[PDB]
Design a protein around this ligand. Structure first.
Ligand SMILES: Cc1ncc(COP(=O)(O)O)c(/C=N/Nc2ccccc2)c1O
Ligand SMILES: Cc1ncc(COP(=O)(O)O)c(/C=N/Nc2ccccc2)c1O
Lengths: 278, 278
């Protein structure tokens, strides 16, 4: 099952999941002019909701979208959670669109659906990843705010086409690379790798998204005496690593067992990552 | 006024413009995973509909979207035109989204609204343009189909943020540039410029959109003995030109009187461009 709530006249309103909620002129539909956050629902609860709401706020600020505020979002999360089975892991997406235009109200929605079995299987069994160039220099987006580098938008056509291109090659997912071959991130994930006793992730001064699963791992790793580093790594670094993972809010930690058709092990490092994230 | 038609059970169905038509799970909303075309409505007619439908077909093919076919689109255009005032110039947008997922039907819509007075004023009086880098090499997108270079998508968040960035600077519109400073195109237009008795436009092997207003100008220019060229121009070329225009289906030909705050004339070349486009 699926469930949806719309923000109407300062209240969360539950509507049937198959009921249309956005008109033809919504700029989130026609232009992809809006932001989202994907919130894991585990045993009927949203363990990391606050983290996601801080990122929703930053995404909304990058796009100059008026945001309804935390109270509002928590009320819409409550609405869609109301009849949700504790046994069924969910993805609760929050969408904010520019609506019919700035001046008129932005459209706020919450939508909840099961995490798919194939996403669960990838968390359990790991993934193959294709590296695909984005064409941009690593330092470019820092000087080009119009490219929306640190924002999570409704404009994911490229993200989806990258994933289809990867599926066509026989891979499960994508890591983007800069022009010079620097790691950036997934269409939908943050890369992390283990090397020389350290956990590495690429810098986001490169204009990628401050991943919340990754932040939570690095904080717990720090506390457990596992050194962490922001490292301007390349695909060479992924091949040479002791282990590689894609981190995301919904899939969680997916070990990367294949990079560009090159099979790799994890040096049995995945267990401590999973313990720290738990 | 505005009007909308949805494709339901092999028929065009008229619905009130304020009526929701897309559910929360439509991938055109949540992911910007769909295509569009914007069709000028002039004196209650769609003079260039066939041209736009051929481009809709190519966009749909780049995204691997099943397309309903020309018959269907012409029926949805007929539906929204039904009560439309001949005196009111319109923009008829056709949207095709991946729907709830491939396997399930794509969502097809037509939506018709007046061309705004400020767009009409720009056609009459011309525009200021900001050049903004896209960060990509001119030759990059040709080797990177996942970047969707020659497709017109529902994923226009960057396009819109570029335009807002330009408005903030005091400009009306944008021309994108490659890393090396080559002209690409507008978020929503094709650049053309006059130099040395020739009409120039940038190559689209660079992964930009084959503009239909531009094709129509170059065809009529050819027939009238005005030489045309595909020219790998830079911003230098826009400053040095005898005249510069942005061409698009809805605004038409907008003379560019200012490039990056540098004012320019058109050498009285705009009249012959407008005669040829008429
Ligand atoms: C570009 C990009 N980079 C990183 C993450 C890692 O973030 P976190 O640990 O907070 O999830 C995401 C995920 N978005 N979430 C998402 C995207 C698409 C579909 C569903 C969810 C992303 O989209
Ligand atoms: C990237 C890009 N490049 C060129 C044109 C020139 O094409 P044509 O002469 O066929 O119009 C368009 C226009 N889209 N149309 C459009 C875009 C946004 C909003 C409304 C219409 C465009 O979006």
């Amino acid at each position: 099952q699926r469930s949806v709530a719309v923000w109407r006249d300062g209240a969360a309103v539950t509507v049937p999941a198959h009921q249309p909620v956005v008109t033809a002129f919504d700029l989130g539909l026609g232009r992809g002019d809006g932001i989202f956050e994907s919130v894991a629902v585990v045993a009927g609860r949203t363990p990391h909701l606050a983290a996601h709401l801080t990122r929703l706020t930053r995404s909304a600020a990058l796009l100059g979208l008026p945001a309804p505020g935390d109270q509002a979002w928590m009320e819409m999360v409550a609405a869609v959670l109301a009849d949700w089975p504790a046994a069924l892991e969910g993805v609760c997406r929050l969408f904010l669109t520019r609506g019919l235009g700035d001046g008129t109200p932005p459209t706020a929605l919450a939508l909840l659906a099961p995490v798919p079995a194939d996403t669960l299987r990838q968390r359990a069994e790991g993934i193959s990843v294709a590296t695909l160039g984005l064409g941009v220099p690593a330092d470019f987006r820092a000087g080009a705010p119009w490219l929306l580098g640190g924002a999570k938008t409704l404009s994911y056509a490229v993200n989806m086409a990258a994933q289809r291109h990867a599926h066509d090659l026989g891979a499960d997912d994508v890591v983007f690379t800069s022009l010079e071959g620097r790691l950036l991130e997934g269409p939908t994930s943050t890369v992390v790798w283990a090397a020389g006793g350290t956990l590495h992730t690429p810098p986001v001064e490169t204009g990628i998204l401050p991943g919340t699963t990754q932040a939570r791992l690095f904080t717990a790793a720090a506390a457990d005496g596992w050194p962490t580093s922001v490292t301007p790594g390349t695909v060479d670094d992924l091949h040479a690593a002791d282990a590689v993972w894609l981190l995301s809010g919904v899939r969680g930690a997916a070990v990367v067992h294949t990079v560009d058709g090159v099979r790799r092990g994890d040096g049995d490092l995945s267990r401590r990552v999973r313990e720290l994230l738990a």
